[PDB]
Amino acid sequence: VIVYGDYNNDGNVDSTDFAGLKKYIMAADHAYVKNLDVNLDNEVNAFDLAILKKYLLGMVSKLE
Amino acid sequence: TVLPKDIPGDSLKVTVGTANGKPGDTVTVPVTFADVAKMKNVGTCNFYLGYDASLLEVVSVDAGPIVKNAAVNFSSSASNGTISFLFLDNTITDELITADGVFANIKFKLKSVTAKTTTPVTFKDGGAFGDGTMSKIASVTKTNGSVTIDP
Ligand SMILES: [Ca+2]
Ligand SMILES: [Ca+2]
Q1: Does B79 contact chain A (CB < 8 Å)?
Q2: Where in the cell is it found (chain B) (predicted)?
């Protein structure tokens, strides 16, 4: 099963994942990762980061 | 012969500026946004610029004055000739980019050359630009810049 937003693969989705995804995006050579592509556009980038932050803030119920 | 896909009307303009000096100078190269309000503000972005590390040393990269709460919302780093930029309004709604102007200032120290040389600072490697609702901006016009080193 896929845990969307679970950057560090610890089963939880929390602030640790947000901090990690920020740094990951900034690595120009960051790889595609299915559980980080929350909007299903075949990229991992700022749009995914924004959706994750909205979810952590309680502004959206679902990572999609 | 061109088609509509080749000719945007409305677009966010992201422009790398230019600078000149002699070896040993430190110069500033801005990255400037225009048409921000037209494009419904900027809520998030990430992109990458390439430069020639044999000719320029990155001294610092700082957010520009259009970026609110940059300590939280803005991040940059430079490695192996690539500068990375990331912005997100971590409040989502309250600290958006809403004005045209300088998004970031890059300070480069100029290295030695044997003849006057112009070296490009260029967009590479993709990225994302999201408006004030964090939705994809439909068109972004990316213009490269340069530094001229005159010995
Ligand atoms: Ca996690
Ligand atoms: Ca994505």
Answers
A1: yes
A2: Secreted
